[PDB]
């Protein structure tokens, strides 16, 4: 509340850190009776459930996989006697979609939104040198006032079912690491950085926010050598001969933030930062003053068995694959990802477009009576995403919506405060975008004028004019691009989705839609369109890997537009992209 | 019990291939089928000759498919009817002496709610009666949008043939029990309009790829297909007037390109290379267990 | 050393516990220069590596996947000031295959064997309220004196390659959770339990081993109710109306072991135990005095991406699948598994045959000059496995070797002390077995007479007499079984391997080897043989899931005898087993 902080939890001189991941207890609550019946004190019946994971794909029955409603997680944690006098705080990386947290039966936090972190202060609720009960009442129902948007339906037997307005499966559960922290009562809550390159090195302007009056120092280490230091909650770190963070050539420095009372250290926060500038100038993405042509993926937090659960082996493999294929960029479609993925991007020198879960916004959608409530949740998600992610060198842009009905009346009243908030929140003033639906054209989109660069999701040759008529698709595509050329007025345009479903091993000569041949033919046509226009400055293909969707006749066990399989092996299209992306120079498409 | 078929195989399109024909009959004997429909066109004579020798029942179908203002109000309808009459005449003249041929299907999924349906159907069903010395029963297959109370064509049929996809095209997915209740709802309507006539199913099924397994099921998996078939057959088995099940389709076959078609149609009980999918074992156990005179009336 | 303890690490009244899993640093050391060059103080170059995982399948290049030799893991851990006076101990669930551990550059532990835990005491090496460097020098080379056995070879360019004598891939790395512990200097090191059923309940005879003189109490809780208590390092817990642990009907009690100095608690250990008896009598496996026909799997610690890394979501899914299919039993082929898998078996009521990595033992193998060294490592592994696992209610038997060349001269001299050790180590005197190679026949096996029950790995109809001649395989199989009937003398026999490689979706009518049809035909024939003989008391099929092997023309991307795919979905054979295993009564095969 007053001590809100989205800093990644750290063990430091002054902070203790204990992970609570593991096997928890779990119970569905179909009659929504748990609070009144006393389930926060003990679950009457339960089953074992690993945390972090989505719960859905662990079961063998469909009613549990598709369960929609209230469900409970429960575990126990020990608070050492020697933590007395510290603040005792629980961190949830995320709980999907909303959560009420109880410790020893007393409610200590509430959170809305399934993809961003929140804390629960339990200093005066825990018993010291004893075990404590942690109960989480979570809910995964969908509505038109949340991110992501959808509805729920009732089946014949009375079970609730989720009905998303979005393509991906409604995975819920506790997807990210949970932490038990001991923190000084006076502590760092936040910090910000801005970067500037100079003739002899670089400068970092910083702020630090603490919840108290005691002085702050900030130091920057390159290994064991201190390269900069500064007193005060605001200041500048001067880094002579700064080693800059670059695409596929990351360099990170160690940041030490301390609060002092006299000669004692009252709090210490530790992080790693990269020295880099990023901005649009002259219709180009400039990284450290040099243009970068973006190439990479829309992704998902999705894998076999675990749903959206964080899995560091999968994360490592995914980066090894993105390095192998020559990607330099990905978008966090369609929700902020676990912090650990950005940390790895920070180390591997990957560029991230950070996206809030504003997907499914499709009378027009923005005329609904419920729009003010939706906007409130959208602003909160945006605020939390930018506060959590603003110091990652990898994060270079914000995507504020995915495929909204931006031809709807009321679009401008909705977009204007959102894009203003994104400008205000970001000390680095990184470019803002949103991805454009196929039904929003250059001349009808009410939202495109707000974007600092335009992001298109286009499927000319799949959803539109697919099949034997690939050349009709190409001409329709060129037709629309001529429109975008007229409305862009210098702005870069990138593609954030395109591709075709194709199964590993489906070969046909000549091609049919769903075959490897068709995908390769579609990609070659699509890239020829891209390459025709000087303003196209990035291609992010849909999707890095096959991922799970709701059931439907259009979805052959989920979405099959992966460049890799869900098991993280290449499909034939991975070799097309590898040759292209490693052949295109980093500054492809002079403007 | 049996199949809607196609004259379709790898490489040759609809070309006649006696080895494929022999294999297909060996498969239909193995699975316990006794019947198939020549969807959606008369087949090569050699297939009827083999049915004659293997003791299979054939519903013989003219290529009156794609008839979907209403379709039967078009100015071009008189010309269409002329070609339809000629095809019907030639089909019945060619096939009338096959012992295997026991029924005529005059249209596949026409828009039989269209105005002008009766003016179109009446002379066709009369011609089929006149042409056949054996006066074998006449049918046509009913589109999913033609309901017991709205179909203008069903009253002409000697037995009703339904193409139904409750749980695939309509109410598919986690909601399989909603599909079952909607299906029972429509069947209660058919019970009211049939007036003693047999009803058979001439299409039903789900696309599923060989080897796609998932627990619990998703549409396109072997599990889903088996779950859908068990639900569907429980509906069939509930009604004394359901006197036949011909599933779609004997084998995976080629369609035009589209996002809905994973290299053609994948509702085959066998692959296009003529090997069983998991559903072939469900049908084999069922069809060889049901007595020949199942469903006393 | 003197404080050796294989107890699972626990947070208690007196013990602190901090997990160290996460992203570590990692470096190959192909020239084996790291110790002399100072890598324990810092790795000169490194890459990020998730722990726990095998390292091999994260990379995109084969030289790294197949790397054989020395490799380094490195991380940092913080020791709080307020841990001063506690013992500071690192626990490694496992390091594969051997490890040298350094803290702040000083060597603090050495361990041989890749599948069992070890500790490193670092009390006097760490800096307090500071960060500390943890470096692990690991090695994955194979030899004929280790478990599992193999050799290494040198390729043309000089790279070492592993050449296993075993089928499974030589996954190495840090496969299991790593822990930082604060423990009282006087503490529980071990405890043992034996169970006895009475007319009014049950009795548990216990021992407790501490490294000091202060008194011990032991308590047993059912929820918040204490149901038994006892003073002394030996004693009996009397549990009136004991709720017994049963197959698919587990019941666990909470065990509290405390050391006291006066009225202060100096140490507390916490565990969960199940009250059950298990023994062979009258040629039957008796669980709580009732016979159980064993059905289930040989398994592997194997999954996509992570190699043998522990993954609790995969573990949960695997148990959900084993419950769905009707299994009641599995063998930990071919090495002890992560403790967490036994803990889940304890909760789901599954029976485990616990197996030491004595695989690849195939002049005869037991005439080699190196046999005394091999036996030494085998005894150590056996000792550690039984000490680690003896208190799991799920663990009901010990498998001492997998497919040794037990026709070799010297077999008896090797087997006799091993089976004697297994008897001595186990307070519960659970039955001992080993799995019999296909070339070891009833009349030629020198080892079978040592087994309390015989375990056969048989492939009649796959490796031997496969194809159109399935009926020749059946008669050869009956022929050998008539031999086993003559040598068993009342002992149960179980099958611990059988099956055929078959790809998901490979259908052929009529069957060919590798098709679903063939697998079903082979299983039906095989089970008809099983069902013919009253002494066959268990079937554990090979294998639960497709798993990775070394490359070869016989291995279509690993081993394809899985009843489930590697992604944990059923193949057609899963439905055959589900119908059979849920139809057979629990006490099938009266004797
Ligand atoms: Mg999506
Ligand atoms: Mg400082
Ligand atoms: Mg093996
Ligand atoms: Mg006690």
Numbering used by the authors:
A (entry chain A), C (entry chain A): 3 to 364, 381 to 609
B (entry chain A): 297 to 364, 381 to 609
From the paper:
Bacterial β-glucuronidase (GUS) proteins comprise one class of gut microbial enzymes that have been shown to reverse Phase II glucuronidation and, in doing so, cause the GI toxicity of several drugs. In an attempt to gain insight into the structural and functional diversity of GUS enzymes, we recently reported an atlas of 279 unique GUS enzymes identified from the stool sample catalogue in the Human Microbiome Project (HMP) that clustered into six structural groups based on their active site loops, Loop 1 (L1), Mini Loop 1 (mL1), Loop 2 (L2), Mini Loop 2 (mL2), Mini Loop 1,2 (mL1,2), and No Loop (NL)20. Here we present the crystal structures of the L1 GUS enzymes FpGUS, LrGUS, and RgGUS, as well as the NL Bacteroides dorei (BdGUS), and show that LrGUS and RgGUS exhibit unique active site features not previously seen in L1 GUS enzymes.
